[PDB]
Design a protein around this ligand. Structure first.
Ligand code: F3S
Ligand code: F3S
Lengths: 66, 66
């Protein structure tokens, strides 16, 4: 399983992650992204998370495997 | 790039990780594993880190992608 993280101190609210993967990322009341789900096992969702991580212009997103 | 982590509270010093991947894991003075390197970009090393993560009998190891 994978767990996504959005560094709130890095994120500038570009939102391309939420664009690419709205099932995994949502905007919060500070205009930053955060994960909508606390675990991913679905391969398709994992793949769009990785796409979002690769696209963030400020490198705010990380993904952990266990 | 990837970063390994070994939860010191979880690890019981089984050491199969160090067996499978001695370039990535070493034993420390408390009898627990820890990462020898702070970053992996080599695919071979990543692969044997993932093998070690899948083999740990107590699930002490995790790997983060950025
Ligand atoms: S700036 Fe923030 S809103 Fe998404 S694309 Fe990067 S984590
Ligand atoms: S118990 Fe510890 S020594 Fe390695 S195989 Fe698991 S992290």
């Amino acid at each position: 399983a994978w767990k996504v993280s959005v560094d709130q101190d890095t994120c500038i609210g570009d939102a391309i992650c939420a664009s690419l993967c709205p099932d995994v990322f949502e905007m919060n009341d500070e205009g930053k992204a955060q994960p909508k789900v606390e675990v991913i096992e679905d391969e398709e969702l994992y793949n769009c998370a990785k796409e979002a991580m690769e696209a963030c212009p400020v490198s705010a997103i990380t993904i952990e495997e266990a």
